[PDB]
Design a protein around this nucleic acid. Structure first.
Length: 362
RNA sequence: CGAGAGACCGAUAGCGAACAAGUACAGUGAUGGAAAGAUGAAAAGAACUUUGAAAAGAGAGUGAAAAAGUACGUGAAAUUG
RNA sequence: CCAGCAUCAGUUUUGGUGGCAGGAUAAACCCAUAGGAAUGUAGCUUGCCUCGGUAAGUAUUAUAGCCUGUGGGAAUACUGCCAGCUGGGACUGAGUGAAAUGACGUAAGUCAAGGAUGCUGGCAUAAUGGUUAUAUGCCGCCCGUCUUGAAACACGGACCAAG
RNA sequence: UGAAUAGGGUGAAGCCAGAGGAAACUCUGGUGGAGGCUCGUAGCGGUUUGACGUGCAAAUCGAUCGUCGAAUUUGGGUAUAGGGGCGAAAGACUAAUCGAACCAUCUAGUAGCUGGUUCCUGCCGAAGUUUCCCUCAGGAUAGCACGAAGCUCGUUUUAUGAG
RNA sequence: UAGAGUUAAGGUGCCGGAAUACACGCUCAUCAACAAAAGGUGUUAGUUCAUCUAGACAGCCGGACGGUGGCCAUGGAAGUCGGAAUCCGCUAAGGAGUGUGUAACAACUCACCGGCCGAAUGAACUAGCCCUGAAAAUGGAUGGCGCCAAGCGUGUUACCUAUACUCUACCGUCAGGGUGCCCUGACGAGUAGGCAGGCGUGGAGGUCGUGACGAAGCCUGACCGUAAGGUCGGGUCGAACGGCCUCUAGUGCAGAUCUUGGUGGUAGUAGCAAAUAUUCAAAUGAGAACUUUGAAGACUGAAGGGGGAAAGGUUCCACGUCAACA
RNA sequence: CAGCAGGUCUCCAAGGUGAACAGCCUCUAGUUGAUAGAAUAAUGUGAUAAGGGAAGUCGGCAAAAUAGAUCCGUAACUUCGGGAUAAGGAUUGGCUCUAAGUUAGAACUGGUACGGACAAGGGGAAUCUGACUGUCUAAUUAAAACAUAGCAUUGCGAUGGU
RNA sequence: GCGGGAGUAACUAUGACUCUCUUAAGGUAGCCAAAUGCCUCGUCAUCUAAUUAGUGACGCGCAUGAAUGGAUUAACGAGAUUCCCACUGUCCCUAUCUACUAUCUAGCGAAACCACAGCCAAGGGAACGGGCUUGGCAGAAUCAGCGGGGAAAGAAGACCCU
RNA sequence: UGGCUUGUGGCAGUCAAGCGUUCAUAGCGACAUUGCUUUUUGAUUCUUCGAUGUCGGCUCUUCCUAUCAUACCGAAGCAGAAUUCGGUAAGCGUUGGAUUGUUCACCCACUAAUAGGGAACGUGAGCUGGGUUUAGACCGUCGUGAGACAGGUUAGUUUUACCCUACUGAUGAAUGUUACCGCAAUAGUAAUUGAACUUAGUACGAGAGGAACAGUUCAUUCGGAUAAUUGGUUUUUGCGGCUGUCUGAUCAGGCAUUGCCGCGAAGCUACAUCCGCUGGAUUAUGGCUGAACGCCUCUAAGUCAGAAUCCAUGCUAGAACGCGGUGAUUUCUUUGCUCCACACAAUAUGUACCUUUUGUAUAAUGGCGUCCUUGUGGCGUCUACCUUUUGUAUAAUGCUAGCAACGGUGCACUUGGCGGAAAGGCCUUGGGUGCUUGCUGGCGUGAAAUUGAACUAUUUUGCGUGGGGAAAAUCAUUUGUAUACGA
């Protein structure tokens, strides 16, 4: 009953498909016990990268404040629209509300979405898009919600506004998003001014915190043991056992556990990557790219031309030094970081020195 | 070749074979060699009518009975509604 | 027709409770009186040191050990009784209606003998109004053959018919 | 005894000429003939590697490798049949069988060894021990109870013999 | 062979029926649950003795004396190396010495012993509960829950307890008294094996009885009770077979990698025949990618062109069919 | 046995390119088989590439260097029949011109490269045995086994030896 | 078919030569640690980041020796080791793209093939239990995957004795 | 082979005399033994012939620490530092080559440095087949010999599709429904080290030397993220060279020889880019007040400081963990009106105690009688939950109707308000229903109309009847960073 060393990550079991295109995360990043109102996460779309030629954050370096080449995902963040701020409190059973406080006017892309009109799946009943529901009487009793003592974290059901980013569809992408803030009272009080229609981007993301890069990754294949775990080939490479593996079980006992080196789905969950440090926030048009060299390929920010398989960016973006899962077209969900490691390098803006602009190709 | 009988069978028995069993077949080849019986008194083995394309499905006649209809005794089960 | 099980009245056998007694014996749950040996508690007096106590006298306040003499108590190992009370096995008898072997008692009769059940149950050959889906709960490891020894992870059936 | 090797490279031996040499060596050209000379196809042989083995042939298929005017390859006719035929040898070879072909009969040869083997109840029910064997998974005999007919103890008291 | 009457071996906190009982006791560690040499201020009892108001013992506090460096091992020996004498001193204590210290002096402490204090303390010897010695790999792993009494000894009490024990009847063969058989003794778990008894097929001397106004059989129901398998009854048959009375044979099935065949199984799963592109339109028709025809392309041309012998023998051909069969 | 990826004597010989009968490619001339469409995982089946240059695996197995024509230049030693294409270097086609008609000599330019499809040698240094060519285990042993031209003794006068 | 025991040279160290026993009587030319060596990482030089191969000898021959022959000695090979030059997907180091299928579908239609049953940890035990004792755990309609057990597809084991 | 013992023996405790400068234990240890144990190395036929296939390594699937290195501590016959030794404690890290078949044997270059033990050593239906059970041929050694050997050499079979389970991915369905997502009662997880800037030329020393402790950065290596300044691939779509033949020829265009061969960018990726440590519980050990026990000291009362691991932070998830709301008439075993009145069929706090008949959860469990076979047949009427105990509706006056008094006590529970904020609760005005105590009167006597019937109180479900009311989608066409198919 031996062991051979840990080639590949064990605990992505089961390797379940992330059906919904936007990433979810049950364990949300807990409160900013500093900022009086925030959100927990936000929204993005994966677009492309640039080489930010700047200078180091770590100030005591041997080559301190030199020229530094760096990755950056420049993800488009249009602000999300509220349907209603749901006032989750407690009861003596559990995490149960009392009322929501609706928004009056929603967006336009609420037409096609609020349903589950898809084949081999359940509906919803005729809870369609909004008429004019509970907000008038509901807005005052969320004050009385904290007076219960039985009171929990108040949240807000949101939807996107799409075309603004170059993707042309008008059926919105849904999610609930938790409201953070100072205390339970404050994430209710200041969130009354949030449900009006649209929220702020800058409430959750302060410039130069960190931002944990969760999104939905690509489904690579039905990947075998070589790529999915990390086995080799045998150098004889004949017969049956080329890209196979050896042991799955063991003689004594016959019954093993969930470590075994088999084939199946790779990637494609709502997989969480850790503290990618936020570079800058730029609202409109600032940085460019497009340089005629081989580096890595096919995602170009305002060159001569545009991006391939996305569209040219004329919106409002947030720049994360690092990355975030998906590929082109894929809609992402940027969660914030609860444990912010390094000291916040805010107040002033971070350096942009110069950047190229030409073709990307020949 | 004929007759008679024995505590001597009634289609897995016994002569290879009860019946077109050496004949649709197989092996160069004296040879091996299976499937395989069946109405009634009289065949009268269904005219005629009606539906469907033939198959198939219903009324009507013949005859002692059609609760005998041609693949024609009695009929069980896996199989199979 | 055997076992379980049977109206209603009377009785045996075996053991105990509770009340009582004999064999045989006297300690006790607790039993008198006289003389001598002993020595505990309360109260008083006296002496000495010290603020807290102690020693001696106290038969002259009240009471006892252990022995001797005299006198008086004394329910039970074993064994039987009461059917007061309490639980059962076991026997006799009931329209009409026998024969043989008995006892004691009576103007009476009972015990004891000796003559005679009813339905299913296991299941091979001549039964009750019957086949049977079937909760819940408890018991619960099936052969022909070898060997001291296989439900066993020894051999040997889809299933039916021929031999 | 009949049929088959296109194409392509060299050339001793024999014989002559020309320059040169005392003479012979040397030395320059032509004429010419013997090849396991020699080279590539026909005919013809089998080193490596992958896929098959319930599939196309009862040892198969793909990629890859050898020889050829010599100890050359091949067809047809005809002859040799089991202790014989036959050998540069490997009992290779003979109808997928060859260390003695195959077919049929005597033959249902035989198996001191192993396995399998068909109603029930009742009466009633042991033994794994031995003298002994060219004798050992056996069996003559003896120990113990089968079956059937007719009949058969000891508890313990006096001593005697032996560690 | 069955229900009662009484109890063994052994159990009662709980899984799972029965004391969370009673009395006394060490110990409370979850002891209970392996282990020696060898060892211990847990903690209790008995016996003997040193020791004690004749001032036990501890802590704290002193005198550390004169002879004197006693003497002697030895290079040196110094109380302080080895070995012997064994005191005086001052006669209310200091030995010719308990321990440390420097080669050693130099330095220091004290049983012996002094001074405060004022009651039971201490060595042996014996016994018990504890306690130290004790490491290995899949999930409690020295119990599931867990228990500090729901542990254990000693003494006691209550409840539970073998078809045996035990009551009485019943089943099996045989004996005696007296037939017909009844009373009735002793035993009855069971494999080989023998005997007895009972059920059994084909067949038969016998054969009358039953039968076409409904025989064997098929199929289905009732269906006695000793394990063996057989009588009656219902739907139905269209000719066969038993009273009586006894004799005879190829005479009872679960099995040797067996035997005669169908049917199951993997399974409607794989296979569906060596990688020389196929696209589009028509004729005919019930049905057309396939026959057949046209347009167009892949493809080979020392053969996909041409063509004789062995061997086979009418398979060519035209006519004619779509069933079995590809 | 088979409507099986098979065994199976044996006939005839055009064009231009490359010796012939390789290859190349059209004629005379013939034809894609007794099932089919769409996507095109894991896994088994084809090629490309940075940097390194043997470091890896029983295993240079696998994989790489190189290649023609013509000229120069080149190693021990012989059974004198030999080794040589050793090593070490240099250049091509095409077109013009030499000559109004093999072939070779002069002359000019360009590209990644003149054999441009196709096609076409790795070399240096030390060492064994059977002389050479040849025979071989039919379903797990291609060799040092045995033969080989040649040589000797012995049987042995053939009416031999056998 | 082709010997033993004993004694013996300056000096560490050795036995030329000599004697004695035994038997029918005791070997030359030339070579050695083997397809044969117990003893032996023997003993020495050179090579190697270590290097016993390459190549240089040592003598310490368990047990070399001339016709089913020593020995001279050139050519030839799908046969056998090492050093040396250029170098290499074998590996470092894996990625990417491509042909065909898997996924999925139609048709007709295999294969040997028939145990009640299908958790694990501890415990007893025909002796390594999903199956038996306790305790923890364990639902069904469905498809694609992958090589660990049970021990597959199969033949009365290959060792081993009669 | 498995079992057994530990033979042959390994390890430790350790008798501790010796000997190391004095000196039983810094160290060395005569002489050996006791317990443990299963490793050197084997005793035994206990259990096995219708299989019990070998070694070193590649690859991938565990657990323990008889402990090499990382956290924490103490001591020396140790000057700091080099050197020497012992305790708490299993989360993680644990090299590259050469000799040799080969770990053993035996050597080198570094590096922070290169552990121990078991587990069918994962381990031939994943893998090599060098190591490892037969068959060409030769030598040594032995026997009369065919031939043999406890001695060596040369060639000489790894077949195929996993029945059941382990098991890794993807869909389909269960207390109205439900697109969409947060709790953390729980499940899976991640992990290491060095150098340099710099601390400091300070501590301490004869001399070589150079400690405590900070702030700062980065390089080996792993996983997840990874598509821009890198490195390459890109048959898709474009660009360079050579041969033959056809389309009538020239020519303009094609098939064909891998993408013919020669050179880029879609589409992907690394040889590459980005990122990564909170609170709680306690041990060795040291003290703190103070014992057991006049002094004393960490423990009996009393009371604190305190370790990688432990344990949680950080991320995934069938209330036993995808929480659960707004707003409202579902994919789906399956019947399906948004209304609500009457009637009917069965079950229940542990569904008791128990027992006979082919047939008891069940009345044995008001009282009395006309009828009346009679210990029969037949006819008529009916009084909670919950609690106490001998038991428990427990309840003594022939029945029924009417009236009066003490003037209290119980329950359901509307209307009206306040407040908790899901456990939904109470109180009181108007209103509704029932009960205590005492007295008095009557008991004759008849129809309308209709029928199949219940352990029918209660609760759940269903049918019949009746009056005012009423709405989402499945398919499929076409596509994605959605991709295996699904979702």
């Amino acid at each position: 009953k031996y062991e051979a060393p840990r080639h590949g990550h064990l605990g992505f079991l089961p390797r379940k498909r992330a059906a919904s295109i936007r990433a979810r995360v049950k364990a949300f990043p807990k409160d900013d016990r500093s900022k009086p109102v925030a959100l927990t996460s936000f929204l993005g779309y994966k677009a492309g990268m640039t080489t930010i030629v700047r200078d180091l954050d770590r100030p005591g370096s041997k080559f301190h404040k030199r020229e530094v080449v760096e990755a950056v995902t420049v993800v488009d963040t249009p602000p999300v629209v509220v349907v209603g701020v749901v006032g989750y409190v407690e009861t003596p059973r559990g995490l149960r509300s009392l009322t929501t406080v609706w928004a009056e006017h929603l967006s336009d892309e609420v037409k096609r979405r609020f349903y589950k009109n898809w084949y081999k799946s359940k509906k919803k009943a005729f809870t369609k898009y909004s008429a004019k529901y509970a907000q008038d009487g509901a807005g005052i009793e969320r004050e009385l919600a904290r007076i219960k003592k039985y009171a929990s974290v108040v949240r807000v059901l949101v939807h996107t506004q799409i075309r603004k980013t170059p993707l042309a569809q008008k059926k919105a992408h849904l999610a609930e998003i938790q409201l953070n803030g100072g205390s339970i009272s404050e994430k209710v009080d200041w969130a009354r001014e949030h449900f009006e229609k649209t929220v702020a981007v800058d409430s959750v993301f302060e410039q130069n915190e960190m931002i944990d890069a969760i999104a939905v990754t690509k489904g690579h294949g039905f990947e075998g043991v070589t790529h999915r775990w990390g086995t080799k080939k045998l150098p004889r490479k004949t017969h049956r056992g080329l890209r196979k593996v050896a042991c799955i079980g063991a003689w004594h006992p016959a019954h093993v556990m969930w470590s075994v080196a088999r084939a199946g789905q790779r990637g494609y969950h709502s997989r969480t990557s850790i503290n990618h440090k936020i570079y800058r926030v730029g609202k409109g048009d600032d940085e460019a790219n497009g340089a005629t060299s081989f580096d890595r390929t096919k995602k170009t920010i305002t060159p001569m031309g545009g991006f391939v398989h996305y569209g040219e960016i004329k919106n409002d973006f947030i720049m994360v030094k690092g990355c975030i899962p998906g590929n082109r077209k894929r809609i992402v969900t940027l969660r914030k970081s609860l444990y912010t490691n390094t000291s916040r390098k805010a107040l002033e803006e971070v350096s942009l020195k110069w950047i190229d602009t030409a073709s990307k190709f020949g």
